[PDB]
Each structure stands twice: as C-alpha cells, then as structure tokens.
C-alpha cells in the first residue's frame, strides 16, 4: 500500500478535513430544481438556504457541461458537503457533486451499508446504523461523509497526534456487488482548504446501494 501519510499534510489541511467530515453542516435535501444560469459546469440553487446568516444560494460544481446538461432544471436530490470560503471567486455557498435525479430513486426501507474495519490488520465490528441511504443510486460523497464522520468520532481520524489521533494512513473502499471498486486515500488531501479538498467529489460518482458494502483499512504506522 502506497498510501499518503498524515505527517505529509499541509499546515491547515488536517483541521479543514476535521471541519468537512465531522463539524460542517451538510447540504441534505430532496425535490430541488436548479434555476436559470448561463454559467458552464455549475448548477445554481437560489434560496436553497432558509434562515442562514451567511448564505441564500447553493452553487453546485459538476466539472463538465455534459454533466450540467443532464441535471439543469431537472428534479434532483442533494447530499454533499458545502463551503463558503473561496466560493464564487455574495451570500452563496459551494459544493462539488452530490447530485442525483429525484424521480424513481427512493427506496421503501433505508439501506444500511455494512462496514468492514481493519486497524493494523485487526478486524473490528462497526454498528450497522453508521452508513445508511434512502436512494437506489447513491453518490460516493453521501457514503464517504457518513463513513469519515464515524471514523473521526471514534478514532480521532482528523485530530492532531497530541489530541489523540493515532491513525497515520487510511483507505476507504466502496465495493459494488458486480465486483466494482471506488477507493479513496484518507490522507491524499489536495491543498489545505475545502475549495481544493472537496474537489474529489466533482466527478459526481454514483453507485448502487443494493448489496453494497464498505471496506476500511486504518494504520497507526
């Protein structure tokens, strides 16, 4: 495993990873339609925020125009991490991906995604209610945010070494029933601020919830 190290992170990256995955409020809503905007690669959600002292609108970055054309004006579900710092170059928050078409994507009963954990090779039981979804087709972002929230609350994943954070290297694996893999290095952080750290979700990678499990490999070395 050629996993990136916790020590290799930039000055404020660790604290900002801690904010995104454990503290920061998430953009979680159903049945939303993007407004008229001439901007390429982005969806504008006017009046998304109700009673927020900083934001009114939500700006969603999808990367390409082909991804934007698929979701522009369409009925959509939102689940992702939003940020205000370095967003739109006012009263607007930004997000990378976390977009799924609303219609016919809901389940009758919420799918609890099983988590298989390994701390330096040792297997450890994870409560089943940690990672859960109500969607048939789910974004990787929706699952990763829930998985990294449990990791920080339990192990102090994004806490400093002096603050009890023992994990130095980590790997999150989203294993699909067909034998497909989506894997993110827990410490391969791009930059130090959410505008660059959350850029991994821009591709808007969506996977099937039916018979899907999560594989986690944590190392204190």
């Amino acid at each position, epitope marked *: 495993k050629d996993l990136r190290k916790k020590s290799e992170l930039q000055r404020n990256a660790l604290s900002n990873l801690r904010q995104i995955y454990y503290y920061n*409020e998430k953009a979680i809503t159903e049945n939303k339609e993007s407004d008229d905007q001439f901007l390429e690669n982005t969806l504008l959600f006017k009046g998304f925020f109700t009673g927020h002292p900083w934001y009114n609108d939500l700006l969603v970055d999808l990367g390409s125009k082909d991804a934007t054309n698929k979701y522009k004006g369409k009925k959509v579900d939102l689940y992702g991490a939003y940020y205000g710092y370095q967003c739109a170059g006012n009263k607007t928050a930004c997000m990378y991906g976390g977009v799924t078409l609303h219609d016919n994507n809901r389940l009758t009963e919420e799918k609890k995604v099983p988590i298989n954990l390994w701390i330096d090779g040792k297997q450890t039981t994870v409560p089943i209610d940690k990672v859960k979804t109500s969607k048939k087709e789910v974004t990787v972002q929706e699952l990763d945010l829930q998985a990294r929230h449990y990791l920080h609350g339990k192990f102090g994943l994004y806490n400093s070494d002096s603050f009890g954070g023992k994990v130095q290297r980590g790997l999150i694996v989203f294993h699909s029933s067909e034998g497909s893999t989506v894997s993110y290095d827990l410490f391969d952080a791009q930059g130090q601020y959410p505008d660059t750290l959350l850029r991994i979700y821009r591709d808007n990678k969506t996977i099937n919830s039916e018979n899907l499990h999560i594989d986690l490999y944590l190392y204190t070395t």
Partner: T-cell receptor
Framework: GIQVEQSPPDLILQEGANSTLRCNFS?????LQWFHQNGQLINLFY???GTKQNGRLSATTVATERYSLLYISSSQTTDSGVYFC???????????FGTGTRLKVLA | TGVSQNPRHKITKRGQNVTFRCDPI?????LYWYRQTLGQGPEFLTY????????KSRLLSDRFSAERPKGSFSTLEIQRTEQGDSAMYLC??????????FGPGTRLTVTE
C-alpha cells in the same frame, strides 16, 4: 515579517491637553485599526487610508509612507489606558498589534 | 460589541484541560482567537473564514485546538494547562478583511 511600532510607549498628559499618537508599520496594509483598552477593546477607528473624525478623536493614515496618527483633543481622565494600533499587511496571515501607547491623564 | 464569550472567568489546576466558547456577530464570516498576557498587546493565535481554518500562528503549542462545531460559534481547547497559560483569551469577528469586533474575553488563571 510584518512589524508594528507605536510611539510614545508611555504618555503623560495634563487634563484638557492635546496629543498625537503614532503607529509605524513595515508593509502595505488592507486593514488598520485603532483601539482603546480599559480588558474590552473599544473600536476607535477602522482606517487603512485617509482621514476620519469621531468627536474629540481624529485619525489619519498615509498608506504609502506607512504610518498612522491618532489625535486626542481636550483629554479627559476617562481617556486613560492603553491605545492599540493593529495591521494585517497585504504570504502567511497574522494580525499584528503594536505594544501600545499607555496614556495617563493627570487631573 | 455583539460578540459573546463564555466563561468570562475560569480557574483550573495545572495539568487540567480547559475549553472556551465564542459566539460571533451572526452576519460575520470571519472569526479570530487572540491571547493577551499582562502588560502586553493581543497576540494572534488562529482565524477562520466561514467553515474553514485559514491560519494558525507558527508559535502556537500543539496543546491548542480551535474548532467551529455547529455553524457560527467557535471553541478553543487548551490541554494540560501550565502557569504560562494564565491570560485573557480574546475573540473577534468581521465581514472579511474589514473592522474586527472584540468579545469581552475569558480571564484564565492556572493555579498549582
């Protein structure tokens, strides 16, 4: 890095007299503020450039010459305490406060 | 000013962990943390802009952790307090690079 120098460090004023407090800084500024401390920092002026007035108090900052002046007209015993100058400086952010001007107004 | 801080005063035995809270002016996106020792001016510890920590001073002990837990408010944790930690911990808020509004401060006394 960014350096702030306030003069005089200590000032003795007779009741009713006027005085000019100086703040010198090393680099170009985006934010310059003058404060008065009693342990609550009282905001006197936000002045990165130009001239402003606030009653018996007045301030002026020459951004190019890298200095800021604070004028106290008709000094009162309540004007006693520490006056602070603080800058942000337009690499790595740090908001730097000066050592301050401790003012003692003689009744 | 509109910036709140709790507790206003705090006594801790040396070696104990202490946590302070700052509630900024709602509209302000920027939040600052300062330390002020007797006779000296306020010293920059760290600052936030929205949900992100922008900078922490190079000379700031690994015993310090500043977070924005649930929106606007911020917490400052000092673990294993020592006599040298006895200071006035000041919090400030602003709309970007504009005027900073200070809180009443937290008087911390670290006793033996």
């Amino acid at each position: 890095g960014i350096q702030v120098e306030q003069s005089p460090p200590d000032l003795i004023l007779q009741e009713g007299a006027n005085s000019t407090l100086r703040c010198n800084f090393s680099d170009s500024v985006n934010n310059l503020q003058w404060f008065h401390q009693n342990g609550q920092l009282i905001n006197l002026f936000y002045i990165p450039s130009g001239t402003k007035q606030n009653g018996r108090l007045s301030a002026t900052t020459v951004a190019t010459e890298r200095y800021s002046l604070l004028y106290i007209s008709s000094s009162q015993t309540t004007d006693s305490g520490v006056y602070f100058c603080a800058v942000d400086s337009a690499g790595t952010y740090k908001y730097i406060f000066g050592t301050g001007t401790r003012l003692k107004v003689l009744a | 000013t509109g910036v709140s801080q709790n507790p206003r005063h705090k006594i801790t035995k040396r070696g104990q962990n202490v946590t302070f809270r700052c509630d900024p002016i709602s509209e302000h996106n920027r939040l600052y943390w300062y330390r002020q020792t007797l006779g000296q001016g306020p010293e920059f510890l760290t600052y936030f802009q929205n949900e992100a920590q922008l900078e922490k001073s190079r000379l700031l002990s690994d015993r310090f952790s500043a977070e924005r837990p649930k929106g606007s408010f911020s917490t400052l944790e000092i673990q294993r307090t020592e006599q040298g930690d006895s200071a006035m911990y000041l919090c400030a808020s602003s709309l970007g690079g504009y005027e900073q509004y200070f809180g009443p401060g937290t008087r911390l006394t670290v006793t033996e």
